[PDB]
Amino acid sequence: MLKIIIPTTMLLPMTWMSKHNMIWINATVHSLLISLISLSLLNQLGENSLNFSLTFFSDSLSAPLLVLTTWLLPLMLMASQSHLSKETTTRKKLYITMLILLQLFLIMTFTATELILFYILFEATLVPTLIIITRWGNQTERLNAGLYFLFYTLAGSLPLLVALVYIQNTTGSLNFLIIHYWSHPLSNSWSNIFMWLACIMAFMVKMPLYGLHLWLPKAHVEAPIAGSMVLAAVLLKLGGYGMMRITTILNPLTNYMAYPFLMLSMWGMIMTSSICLRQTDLKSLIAYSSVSHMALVIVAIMIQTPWSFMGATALMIAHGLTSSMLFCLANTNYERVHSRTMILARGLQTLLPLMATWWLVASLTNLALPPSINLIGELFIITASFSWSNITIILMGMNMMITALYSLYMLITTQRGKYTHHINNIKPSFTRENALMALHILPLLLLTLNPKMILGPLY
Amino acid sequence: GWVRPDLGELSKVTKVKTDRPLPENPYHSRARPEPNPEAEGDLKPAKHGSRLFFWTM
Numbered sequence: 367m368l369k370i371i372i373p374t375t376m377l378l379p380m381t382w383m384s385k386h387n388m389i390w391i392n393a394t395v396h397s398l399l400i401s402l403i404s405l406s407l408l409n410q411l412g413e414n415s416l417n418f419s420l421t422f423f424s425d426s427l428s429a430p431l432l433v434l435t436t437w438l439l440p441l442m443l444m445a446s447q448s449h450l451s452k453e454t455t456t457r458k459k460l461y462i463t464m465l466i467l468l469q470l471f472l473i474m475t476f477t478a479t480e481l482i483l484f485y486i487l488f489e490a491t492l493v494p495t496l497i498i499i500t501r502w503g504n505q506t507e508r509l510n511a512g513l514y515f516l517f518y519t520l521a522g523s524l525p526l527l528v529a530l531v532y533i534q535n536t537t538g539s540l541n542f543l544i545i546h547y548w549s550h551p552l553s554n555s556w557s558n559i560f561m562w563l564a565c566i567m568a569f570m571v572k573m574p575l576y577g578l579h580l581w582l583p584k585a586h587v588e589a590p591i592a593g594s595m596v597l598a599a600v601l602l603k604l605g606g607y608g609m610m611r612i613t614t615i616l617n618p619l620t621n622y623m624a625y626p627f628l629m630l631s632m633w634g635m636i637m638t639s640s641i642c643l644r645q646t647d648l649k650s651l652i653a654y655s656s657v658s659h660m661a662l663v664i665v666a667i668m669i670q671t672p673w674s675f676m677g678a679t680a681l682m683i684a685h686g687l688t689s690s691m692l693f694c695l696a697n698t699n700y701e702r703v704h705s706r707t708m709i710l711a712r713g714l715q716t717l718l719p720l721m722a723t724w725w726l727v728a729s730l731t732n733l734a735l736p737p738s739i740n741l742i743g744e745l746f747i748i749t750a751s752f753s754w755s756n757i758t759i760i761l762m763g764m765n766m767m768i769t770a771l772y773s774l775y776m777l778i779t780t781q782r783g784k785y786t787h788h789i790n791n792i793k794p795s796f797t798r799e800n801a802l803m804a805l806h807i808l809p810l811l812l813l814t815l816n817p818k819m820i821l822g823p824l825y
Numbered sequence: 826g827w828v829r830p831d832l833g834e835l836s837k838v839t840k841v842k843t844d845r846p847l848p849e850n851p852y853h854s855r856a857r858p859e860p861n862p863e864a865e866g867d868l869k870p871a872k873h874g875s876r877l878f879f880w881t882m
């Protein structure tokens with residue numbers, strides 16, 4: 367697995383010894399090459415896993431997330447090129463260093479055969495994101511956002527650590543393989559109930575759960591474009607990956623303990639979808655839509671059936687790509703208008719038609735139009751939920767309707783109607799922005815041709 | 826016929842011919858507890874190293 371980790375580490379000396387006007391070109395080229403290298407982990411087995419060494423292993427749950435993580439860095443560099451143009455060379459190199467460090471931590475987090483090593487890297491990711499938000503954010507609220515984004519996480523993550531070490535004192539190991547093979551039933555006890563809660567809440571706060579989702583709109587609205595991209599695409603999926611990994615030792619207590627979280631998710635998806643209907647901020651709207659999709663993923667993981675896990679994997683990948691694209695489109699609007707308010711710049715289809723096409727495709731894929739992988743994950747989760755209880759179909763159908771409603775509302779408000787008269791600084795879209803949108807969207811429509819690559823280890 | 830002892834003669838340490846048996850346990854001591862096993866052997870490398878969390882060495 368070092369054939370991916372070492373080039374990512376070499377990205378740092380290459381960045382810092384680059385010329386003042388060659389940092390973006392070199393970083394983008396070598397990040398794309400690293401993505402191409404990482405693309406060969408998709409050759410998975412129907413047997414156990416790709417156990418490279420005692421420290422790192424690969425899975426068909428890990429490999430799609432790793433490929434997405436590698437693919438996200440070049441796009442983040444392209445998106446950050448514009449608003450960081452007036453910046454000093456040292457600070458641009460520091461920004462690129464933060465991005466590379468975040469990729470390295472994510473890559474090691476997703477393989478991480480140990481639960482303590484997974485926890486350490488899972489929390490190491492928290493530092494570069496915090497620096498990116500609180501340093502290169504525009505508004506005065508960024509600091510506050512960072513505080514929220516920090517403490518929420520730690521509020522859930524310190525109990526997990528305690529539980530983790532406790533488990534190793536009783537089991538003797540925290541290796542995923544030994545943990546899976548030597549799993550024993552968890553008795554219905556108060557001690558076991560609190561161990562279950564300690565194991566779950568850390569990943570639950572990062573999805574985020576509906577009750578604990580307040581940090582996310584703050585962090586996304588306050589962060590720069592690359593920060594928003596990585597938060598929506600990869601960092602939200604750490605909770606899903608961790609829950610899928612750790613729920614193996616929580617049976618049969620999950621049957622009883624899942625009820626409050628299932629109710630919170632099934633009602634909060636309706637709640638956040640309706641919130642999206644009355645939102646004056648594009649970034650806030652996209653953040654709330656992300657909360658709804660991750661609520662569906664939480665339901666999938668808690669149900670804990672093969673179709674649930676397949677749908678959860680597919681939905682995580684699809685949402686990562688779609689939400690990153692949506693944030694990029696909103697940022698292209700913001701870099702022209704400097705307002706970030708949806709109602710201000712109107713009728714942009716008449717002034718920017720190709721970007722209107724990109725908006726339409728992104729809205730269609732957020733809307734879960736078949737046969738997109740968004741709908742593949744949605745439908746698999748919905749079928750699993752129907753088998754769990756036939757009454758869930760009501761809430762799922764309401765969520766689908768409201769999702770279509772706010773997606774097309776966001777499209778119509780910004781692209782249709784009459785242009786705002788007093789806005790005259792709207793320039794033709796750049797080749798960089800069009801290429802960014804294309805590099806987001808073509809992978810989705812290619813993945814719909816080979817869905818088994820993103821359906822996980824239970825396929 | 827008594828000759829007075831000289832200086833430092835009555836402070837000499839002298840020997841005594843006695844038939845009284847030497848007390849074998851004048852302190853009435855109990856039996857001393859057995860010592861610890863004081864294990865001895867040849868050192869070998871630690872099995873799989875430190876075995877601390879994820880460290881392989």
Ligand SMILES: CCCCCCCCCCCCCCCCC[C@@H](O)O[C@H](CO[C@H](O)CCCCCCCCCCCCCCC)COP(=O)(O)OCC[N+](C)(C)C
Pocket residue numbers: 554555556559575576577578623626627
């Ligand atoms: C806020 C945003 C979201 C955050 C996350 C929320 C999710 C956390 C919810 C916790 C899950 C449930 C906790 C315990 C579930 C076990 C079931 C139990 O509570 O119900 C009855 C238990 O009876 C009573 O409930 C006893 C507990 C009463 C005291 C709890 C306080 C009630 C309200 C407090 C809610 C505050 C939550 C947040 C705290 C900060 C069952 O009867 P019994 O057969 O006897 O017990 C069987 C279990 N045994 C065998 C282990 C003993």
